[PDB]
């Protein structure tokens, strides 16, 4: 019809999705209300301006921001001086999503830089001279796989990498993030990711890891950092993804996990929150929404007959609307929410989430949903590694040619 | 000594007591990627840090230098490691170090390294006497700080400091009944003390949660807690629950109440309840109201629940194809 508003967030009924504080104001409700009001303005801007809304992914703007950042950053990034392989990964992945080629000058320089970050005893550090750590090790490997050249693959010292993983492994099945460091579910995921990609997984490497991870699932259905802690999207993603890599998703109560993650999508904003009663945030477009593709694959593997064959169990349209309308910086780059400043981390995760929301795949079945102008479509991303599915296949195949360290 | 923010702060390359050392510039390679244009202060401190680390100089000045390197980038785990090496080698007073870490955490509470360092100090000292109060102060500024709650769970568990936590949980729940971290803590304390098997405890818990639900019908946390503490034994195992929820329907509805009802029906259906069909239809009706009107953001999930229930509980579900 003519009166029909195609954008879900702009429909008149949508206003009914506003927070109901039951007249009991608390810090949580007050904060949530502030966000909704700010987001309501974004939604209503077209109406008050008397313009027909057109949702455009500012590709050219994002490309400039990325292209320059891959080379040089301001002192605003001093807080990430111990996370440079992450800067490499976040940027290269964003470019990959936007379907921008990586010139060999760049690829070769990234490789050489990443090898300067590699430790003499395995793993990668946050910068040259820094001790290895599982987070930048995960980032570096992903970054080299996105490049995917013989050079890129060759940078990784696999025997030392395996030695490194073992030096971090704990008796209870967990892993330290680095020597003398902290333990939480992120380490299990970082380790499984790099180990699977490089084919260095030995029979006992992940002994007890699945059980340890399963102990992190709590009464909420989600997964916390360590056993006993509140369920959170970053940890839940790490947990399920690591379990998927280890082929042990079944250790979890997938049903309660599914109900928890689906409940994390904000009825009004359309984006996802990190934990119950906290605020919406663009990066969770990946951490939270990325769980649906994983849960779909797990449930389907159990022969679940009620599974949809064209959509994920989340409102794909609403997430895309949230990202497109509220998470883009006019100058390029993406963000947490309106009012927040852009950064490469949110740029990487908002785009990753957008891609997830646009593409549904289940074997032969394929179905896209591209909100706004058709040029908004991005390249697909693998739900476990968050790098191109083709890069995953290429990397694994290449590493399967080599024997698991020690044979 | 000289704070990083002191108006009279001087670069290390301009300090006489550091004249013997040659700062080590960062090895970024001939053509850098993701190169950060560090400020002069940052680069100066780190060049000297590289120098001391490289030569493994376990000295008092190196120790003082790490404080500055940390203030410039508290996320630099390599600096924290070297500082811990220096603490042991130089035989530094750990209570003084505890004083330092509490100040740092106060200013940058959402950092992994600071909480880990404090944990190491506590372990080394085997003294948790300052923990709960310290954490309480951080939680008083951000009642949902993840690291703070995680550290609190570790302290309480490792040192068995359970006695006053439920009281603390009740206090915070009063301040903000919507605080999910506090509900999670409540579950943590009960699971590790009396447990939820004790009928008196469970009952008390459920009464309390239902009362909070009555006061703030739309607070998702209470709803999640109630489901979380009953779901394991099975929702259908508690026959009165259903009637009681149905009673809140008029003056206390929410997509939360309606969703819970579906969870009860789902379980009833799995534990061969009476009127199988009567129940299944009630459930599918709610799934439809949810997907279509009361909770459309989750339409895909609700439609799936509807298909799952249909698929396994319809009168035809057990009937052979030939019939």
């Amino acid at each position: 019809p003519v009166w029909s508003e195609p954008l879900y967030s702009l429909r008149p009924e949508h206003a009914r999705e506003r927070l109901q504080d039951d007249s009991v104001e608390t810090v949580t409700s007050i904060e949530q209300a502030k966000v909704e009001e700010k987001i309501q303005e974004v939604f209503s801007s077209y109406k008050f301006n008397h313009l027909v809304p057109r949702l455009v992914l500012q590709r050219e703007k994002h490309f400039h921001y990325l292209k320059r950042g891959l080379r040089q950053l301001t002192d605003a990034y001093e807080c990430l001086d111990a996370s440079r392989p992450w800067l490499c990964y976040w940027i290269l992945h964003s470019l990959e999503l936007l379907d921008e080629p990586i010139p060999q000058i760049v690829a070769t320089d990234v490789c050489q830089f990443l090898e300067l970050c590699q430790s003499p005893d395995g793993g990668f550090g946050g910068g040259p001279g820094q001790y290895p750590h599982l987070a930048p090790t995960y980032a570096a490997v992903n970054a080299l796989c996105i490049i995917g050249t013989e050079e890129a693959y060759n940078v990784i010292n696999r025997e030392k990498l395996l030695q490194y993983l073992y030096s971090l492994k704990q008796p209870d099945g967990s892993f330290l993030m680095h020597v003398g460091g902290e333990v939480d579910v992120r380490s299990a995921y970082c380790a499984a990711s790099v180990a699977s990609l490089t084919n260095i997984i030995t029979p006992d490497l992940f002994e007890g890891t699945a059980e340890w991870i399963a102990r992190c699932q709590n009464w909420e259905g989600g997964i916390g950092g360590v056993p006993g802690m509140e369920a959170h999207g970053g940890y839940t993603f790490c947990g399920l993804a690591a379990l998927v890599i280890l082929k042990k998703e079944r250790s979890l109560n997938l049903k309660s996990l599914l109900q928890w993650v689906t409940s994390r999508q904000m009825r009004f904003e359309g984006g996802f929150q990190g934990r119950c009663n906290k605020l919406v945030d663009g990066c969770y477009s990946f951490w939270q929404a990325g769980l649906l593709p994983l849960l779909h694959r797990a449930l389907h593997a159990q022969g679940d007959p009620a599974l949809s064959m064209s959509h994920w169990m989340f409102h794909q349209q609403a997430l895309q609307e949230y990202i497109l309308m509220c998470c883009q910086c006019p100058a390029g780059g993406l963000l947490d929410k309106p009012g927040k400043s852009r950064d490469f981390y949110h740029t990487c995760y908002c785009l990753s989430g957008l891609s997830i929301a646009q593409h549904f795949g289940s074997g032969a079945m394929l179905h896209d949903v591209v909100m706004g102008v058709p040029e908004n479509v991005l390249q697909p991303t693998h739900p476990v590694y968050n790098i191109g599915p083709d890069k995953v296949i290429q990397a694994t195949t290449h590493f399967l040619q080599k024997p698991v360290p020690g044979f | 000594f000289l704070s990083l923010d002191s108006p009279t702060y001087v670069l290390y390359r301009d300090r006489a007591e550091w004249a013997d050392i040659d700062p080590v510039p960062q090895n970024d390679g001939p053509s850098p990627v993701v190169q950060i244009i560090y400020s002069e202060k940052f680069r100066d401190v780190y060049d000297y840090f590289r120098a001391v680390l490289q030569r493994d100089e376990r000295s008092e000045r190196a120790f003082k230098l790490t404080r500055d390197a940390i203030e410039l980038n508290a996320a630099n785990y390599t600096v924290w490691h070297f500082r811990r090496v220096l603490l042991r080698s130089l035989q530094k007073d750990l209570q003084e170090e505890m004083n330092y870490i509490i100040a740092i955490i106060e200013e940058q509470p959402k950092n992994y390294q600071v909480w880990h360092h404090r944990r190491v100090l506590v372990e080394w000292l085997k003294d948790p006497s300052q923990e709960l109060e310290f954490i309480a102060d951080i939680l008083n500024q951000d009642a949902k700080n993840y690291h703070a709650w995680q550290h609190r769970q570790w302290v309480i568990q490792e040192f068995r400091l359970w006695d006053n936590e439920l009281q603390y949980v009740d206090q915070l729940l009063k301040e903000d009944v919507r605080n999910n971290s506090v509900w999670n803590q409540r579950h943590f304390v009960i699971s590790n003390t009396t447990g939820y098997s004790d009928r008196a405890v469970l009952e008390r818990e459920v009464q309390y949660t239902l009362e909070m639900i009555k006061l703030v019908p739309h607070n998702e946390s209470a709803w999640n807690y109630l489901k979380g503490i009953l779901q394991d034994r099975g929702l259908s195992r508690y026959p009165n629950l259903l009637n009681q929820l149905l009673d809140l329907q008029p003056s206390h509805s929410s997509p939360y109440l309606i969703a819970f009802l579906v969870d009860i029906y789902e379980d009833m259906l799995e534990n061969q309840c009476d009127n199988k069909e009567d129940i299944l239809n009630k459930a599918l009706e709610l799934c439809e109201i949810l997907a279509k009107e009361k909770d459309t953001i989750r339409k895909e999930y609700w439609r799936y629940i509807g298909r799952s229930l249909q698929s396994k509980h319809s009168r035809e579900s057990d009937i052979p194809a030939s019939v």
């Binding site: 996370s83 970053g234 981390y345 | 940058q108 992994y112």
Partner: peptide
């Protein structure tokens, strides 16, 4: 704050 993931 700064970066809360690591």
């Amino acid at each position: 704050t700064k970066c809360v993931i690591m």
